[PDB]
Design a protein around this ligand. Structure first.
Ligand SMILES: O=P(O)(O)OC[C@H]1O[C@@](CO)(OP(=O)(O)O)[C@@H](O)[C@@H]1O
Ligand SMILES: O=P(O)(O)OC[C@H]1O[C@@](CO)(OP(=O)(O)O)[C@@H](O)[C@@H]1O
Ligand SMILES: O=P(O)(O)OC[C@H]1O[C@@](CO)(OP(=O)(O)O)[C@@H](O)[C@@H]1O
Ligand SMILES: O=P(O)(O)OC[C@H]1O[C@@](CO)(OP(=O)(O)O)[C@@H](O)[C@@H]1O
Ligand SMILES: [Mg+2]
Ligand SMILES: [Mg+2]
Ligand SMILES: [Mg+2]
Ligand SMILES: [Mg+2]
Ligand SMILES: [Mg+2]
Ligand SMILES: [Mg+2]
Ligand SMILES: [Mg+2]
Ligand SMILES: [Mg+2]
Lengths: 329, 329, 329, 329
C-alpha cells in the first residue's frame, strides 16, 4: 500500500511506545519543509511584481528565502511543543524555547543550505539533526553540544528538480518524495543502502593549492587510476544537501577538507556534518574528518566546523588509508 | 508594470510586424515548459504509488520524465502550426511536420537536459533553438543544418529550485520566473548582460588525463594563479542547462572540451552548443570550440558534437589566448 | 500559534490517551480529502485532452470523479489499519476490511455528495461518520447499524470556492481551511456555534405538490411572515454538503422532507443525515425528521433514508411546533 | 489536438485580421482570472495565520477577496494597453485609463460575483463584457453606455468545484477548463448550445410576496404543471455566475425579477445582465426583462439595474407569453 511520511512517523512512534512528542516534532518539520518548498519554487512571485497593483504591502516585506526558511523552521518547531533548544545555521546563539512550548528535543538545523546557489536557482535544501535532552538542568546550548552518535533522527529536504525528504533514524534511511499536488510526502525508497563503491568524486577543486597531501594524492588517483581503470567522474553542485543526496543514491565520495581560509574545514558539525554523517552511516556509508569519525566528535561550540569526507565505504576507506599511510611514515 | 512572457512575446511580435507564427510558436513552447515543470516536480506521483488503488491504469504507462518531456515538446510544438522540422536530442532522425500543421520554423531542442542528474533530483532543463526555414523545397533534416548565427531565438527552461525560462532573441536576453501558483512566466531580469570576468570555472575534471595542453594550463591557472591573485571557485552541477545558467547570472566559464571517448566534444551542436552560444553572445559573452566561434560552425549532421567553452568574455578570451600559444610555432 | 489539522488530531488523540488508531484514521481521511480536492479542481486535465499526445494510456482510464473519490476513500481508509467496516453511498453492500488491515472503527461516507452538481461545477463534497465497533462478533454491516448518537466523530469536506474540512467530535465543531499551496488544513474557526435563529431557508420547492401540511405552512410563513417581518431569503445549492455548510456558518434552516418519489425522505441516514445531524447538534443546532431526533433513529438498513430538517435551534423548533400542532388536533 | 485559451484567442485574432489589442486584452483577462482563482482557493492562507511567525507583514494587508479581485482585474486590464474605460461593480465611478496605457476597448465587469456566498465558500465568479469604443471624443462613462447588442465579447469565470472560463463572441460560446497544474485554460466544450427546454427553475422565492402576477403564475406552473407533466426541480445557488452556468449546461430558466426593494430588478445591466444575455443568445437561449430583450436596452447609468429572465428558449418564451397574457385587455 501507499505510505505517506505522516503515516510512517505515526507508526514508528507507536512501535517505540513513545509519548508522541517525536511524532509531533517530525509532523511539524514536514509542514515547515512543505512551506519552504512552495516558497523556493516561487509560488506567488507575481504579487511581488505588482500583478494586483501596489495597495497590499505598506512598507518592507521582501523577505529573502534564507530568512523566510529560518523563520518557518523556528516557528513551526516551537509550535510542536516538542523542543527546548534550537540551533540554526542562521543564528549566532542557540534559541531557548519558552517554557509554555518546551519539549524534550534539541534540534540543530541548516534552514536553507547552499547560500551561494540560491540566486542561480541551483538545488538547495534544509538539513536537520534531532537529539534528546540528556540533562535535568535548565535548557541551554550545552544540550546541543552532543556527539552525532547521540542523534535520534536526522536528515534533509532537498529542493531540487523535485522535493524529497530523506529521514534517517536508528532503524535506517527512508526517502519520501513530495507530491506538491496533494502536499504529501510519499515513501519511494525504503531502507536505503549506499553502494559499496561509486564512480563519482565531489569536491571544490578551486582550493587545490591548499589541500593536504592525502586529499591531493586521492584526487590524482581518481583522474589517473593506478590500475588503469576508467577515471571517476566529477560532480560538485555546490550545495552540500544536493551533493550528499547524489552521493547517497549514486554512490561515490563527497569531500570538504580544510584549507587556508577554513583550517578546520568549512562545514559546520552540528547542522551539516553530523546530520549527513548519521544518514551515511545508517545507509552503510562512512563519514570521517580523515582522522576520526565525525559522529564521535564531542563539540564545544554550536557553530564548530569540521573537515568532512563521506560516502561509499570503499571510497572513503581508500582515502582514510592514504591518511593512515602518511601518518605511519 | 508586471510583464508576463505571454505579453512580452505578443508585443515583440506586433513590433516586428510578423504574421504571428513565432508568437504562436513561443506560446506553445511556454505551455510545453509548464507541463514539463509540473511533471518534473512530481505532481501526482501519489497516483503512481497506488493512493487510489489499482483500477484506473490497465497496463504500462510509467513513462519516464525524459520520454514524457520529449512527447510534450513534440506534440505542443506541432500543435502550434508554426514548425516544419524538429530535431530532438532523443530522436535519431529529424521530425518532419505534416503539411496540415506545417509552419515555417525549424526547432532544435534538448527535451530534458541532464540525463545523469534526473534520478538524483539535481537541476535539469529544456534547451531550444529556433530557425526560419530558408530553402523553398520540401522540408528535411537539411533545414536544421544552419549555423547558429542564423538563429532567430534560443534559450532554455531550467527546472531548478524554481523554474525559469531564459529567452534570447535578436535584441537581447530576458529571464522569466515561472510562478507555479498561476502558471505565468514573470519577467524578472531584462536585457541581461554577463559580467566581463567571473571567478568560477565549470568543467568535469574527471577527464583530466585526456585534456589537451591548453585546457590543462588554464585549469592550472584557476587553481594556482600565476599573478598570485585569488584562485577561482569550482562548480559543476553536471547538467549543461544549470551550469550555463549559473555562468550567465554569476559570470565565469563553462567548459566541455574534447576527450578520448569524445574526440569532438560530447555536447551536441544543434540543441546544446548553438542555443547556449546564442544566449551567451546576446548577453555579451563568448562561446568557442577553442579555435572557432560556435555560432559559425556549419553543421553537417543533426547530431554533430562540438567542443565548447563559454561564459564571461575575459575568461573565455584568456583560454583562447592559451590555445593560440599552443598553436604558434 | 497556527494549528494544522494534523497537529489538532494528534493532540486530541493524546488528551484521550488513545492508542492512536483514531489519529491514524483521521490523518488518512485528510490525505484522501486532499487527493479528492485536487482531482475535483481538475489538476492535470490537460493530459486527458492530449497535451502530450496519445502514448501513455493504452485503453480505458477516464474514471469519473465520483468513482475516483470512492476509490480514494476506500483505499486510503483501509491503509490506515484503523477500520473494519466501511459503508459507502456508492456501494450496495458494506465493505468488510481484510483482517490484516482491520481496525476497530466503522466509517460511513458519501464520497462525492451532490451528484447532480458535478457536471455544472457547483460545489460538491465528502461526508463522513465514524463509529467505534461495539461487538466482539466478526465485523459485518450490523456494526454500521448504530444510531447517530453513537458517533465518535463526523464531518465533511466541502470542495467549494475553497476546500474546507469541518470536523465534529464530542467536544465541538472545528473548521479547517485547506491551503493547497502546502497541502495543509489550517484551523480557522474554533468551537463553532450556529446562530440561534437565521434568515435563510433551504429546500427544493419543486416538490411543493407533495409536501406535507407542516412543511407547506412553514414555507408560507417564511415568505409571508405573520409578524410582518422581512421574509427569509431562499438558497438551495443542490448539494447537501454545500447547503448544510452555509446553514452552519450563516444560520437558518435546511430541509429535505418526504415526497411521493421519496416517501421516507431522499437523504440517507448513515452517511448524509447522521453526520450532518451530529455536526449540527455539536454546534448547538437541531436535526429532526419532524417527528423524532435524527441521531436517535436506530437504522435497520445501511442505505436507509430519512426526512431531515436541520439548522438554527429557533428555526427548527418553529417547524417542529407546526408538526406538533397538527398532531394535537 | 488540445486547444488552450491562449491559442484559441490568438487564432481568432489572426482570422479577424485584428491589430492585436483584443488578443492582448483577452490574454490579460485570462491572467487575471487565474490569479483570482488561486486566491479564491485560499493558496497561501497559512501565512495569514502565522505559519512563519509575525515578521514579514508590518501593518494592514488582510485584503478581502472582493477587493483583491477588483484590484487584479483593473491592474491586469490596464497593463494590456487595450482598454480606455472600465466599469466595475465595486466602483461608483467609471475608470478612465491613462493615455499611456489607453486602448480602444471598454470593459464592464463584476470582479467577484456572489458577495453573499463568499464567506460560506459557495461558488463565486467574475463576469465581463467588452465593447469597442464608438465615439472619437475623450473617453468617459458614456462609452460604457452601449446596448448589449454592441458587445464584441462577453463571458465569465466560475470559481466552483473547478474553475472554468466561458467565452462568448460573435461566432459562438466556448468553455475552457482551468488546469491549475499548468495554469492553462483547456477548451473542453466548443460552440455550446443550450437545450431548447429544461427542467430546472432558478429564483429566490423569498420575495414571493412581492412578485408580479406573471412570475407568480409561472412558478405555480413549475410546481403544479397544468398539463400534469413532471414538476420542475428547483436550484438557486445565490451567485448569478453559478446559476447561469448551470442554466447554460443543463438548460432551464434563471430569474431575478423586480420586487419592492428592487423595483427595476437587482442585477446590474452593464456587468451582470448584458454579459449573461449575450452568452445566452449566442448559445441559442433568450434573455428578457419580461417585456423587452435585455441586449436592446439602452443604458442610462453605468450602475443601472434591470429585471432578467434567461435560459432555454422554450422556458423563457412560456414566461414571456404569461407576461403578454397579463398585459392584454
Ligand atoms: O563555495 P564552497 O567553498 O565550495 O562551499 C560550499 C559548501 O558550503 C555550503 C555551506 O552551507 O554552501 P554555502 O556556504 O553557499 O551555504 C554548503 O552547502 C556547500 O557544501
Ligand atoms: O557526465 P559528463 O561527461 O560530465 O557530461 C555531462 C554533460 O552532458 C549532458 C548532455 O545532455 O548531460 P547528460 O549526458 O547526462 O544528459 C549535459 O547536460 C552535461 O553538460
Ligand atoms: O435534486 P434533489 O431532489 O433536490 O436532491 C438533492 C439532494 O440529494 C443529494 C444526494 O446526495 O444530491 P445528489 O442525489 O445529486 O447526489 C444531496 O447532495 C442533495 O441535498
Ligand atoms: O440574495 P439575492 O437577493 O438572491 O441576490 C443574489 C443575486 O445578487 C448577486 C449580485 O452580485 O449576489 P450578491 O449581491 O451577493 O453579489 C448575484 O450574484 C445573485 O444572482
Ligand atoms: Mg549549509
Ligand atoms: Mg551560511
Ligand atoms: Mg543535453
Ligand atoms: Mg542524452
Ligand atoms: Mg449525497
Ligand atoms: Mg447518489
Ligand atoms: Mg454580481
Ligand atoms: Mg455587490
Amino acid at each position: 500500500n501507499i505510505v505517506t511520511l505522516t503515516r510512517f512517523v505515526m507508526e514508528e512512534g507507536r512501535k517505540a511506545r513513545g509519548t508522541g512528542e517525536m511524532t509531533q516534532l517530525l509532523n511539524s518539520l514536514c509542514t515547515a519543509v512543505k512551506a519552504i518548498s512552495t516558497a523556493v519554487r516561487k509560488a506567488g512571485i507575481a504579487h511581488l511584481y505588482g500583478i494586483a497593483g501596489s495597495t497590499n504591502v505598506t512598507g518592507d516585506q521582501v523577505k529573502k528565502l534564507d530568512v523566510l526558511s529560518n523563520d518557518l523552521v523556528i516557528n513551526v518547531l516551537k509550535s510542536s511543543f516538542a523542543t527546548c533548544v534550537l540551533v540554526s545555521e542562521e543564528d549566532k546563539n542557540a534559541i531557548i524555547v519558552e517554557p509554555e512550548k518546551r519539549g524534550k528535543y534539541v534540534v540543530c538545523f541548516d534552514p536553507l543550505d547552499g547560500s551561494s546557489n540560491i540566486d542561480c536557482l541551483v538545488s538547495i535544501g534544509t538539513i536537520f539533526g534531532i537529539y534528546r535532552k540528556n540533562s535535568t538542568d535548565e535548557p541551554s546550548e550545552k544540550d546541543a553540544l552532543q556527539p552525532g552518535r547521540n542523534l535520534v533522527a536526522a536528515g534533509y529536504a532537498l529542493y531540487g528538480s523535485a522535493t524529497m525528504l530523506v529521514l534517517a533514524m536508528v532503524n535506517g534511511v527512508n526517502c519520501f518524495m513530495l507530491d506538491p499536488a496533494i502536499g504529501e510526502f510519499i515513501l519511494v525508497d525504503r531502507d536505503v543502502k549506499i553502494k559499496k563503491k561509486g564512480s563519482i568524486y565531489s569536491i571544490n577543486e578551486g582550493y587545490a593549492k591548499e589541500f593536504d597531501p592525502a586529499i591531493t594524492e586521492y584526487i590524482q588517483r581518481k583522474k589517473f587510476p593506478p590500475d588503469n581503470s576508467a577515471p571517476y567522474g566529477a560532480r560538485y553542485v555546490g550545495s552540500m544537501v544536493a551533493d550528499v543526496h547524489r552521493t547517497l543514491v549514486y554512490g561515490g565520495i563527497f569531500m570538504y577538507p580544510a584549507n587556508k581560509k577554513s583550517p578546520k574545514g568549512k562545514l559546520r558539525l552540528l547542522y551539516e556534518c553530523n546530520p549527513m554523517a548519521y544518514v551515511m552511516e545508517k545507509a552503510g556509508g562512512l563519514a570521517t574528518t580523515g582522522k576520526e569519525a565525525v559522529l564521535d566528535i564531542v563539540p564545544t561550540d554550536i557553530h564548530q566546523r569540521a573537515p568532512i569526507i563521506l560516502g561509499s565505504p570503499e571510497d572513503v576507506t581508500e582515502l582514510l588509508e592514504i591518511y593512515q599511510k602518511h601518518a605511519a611514515k
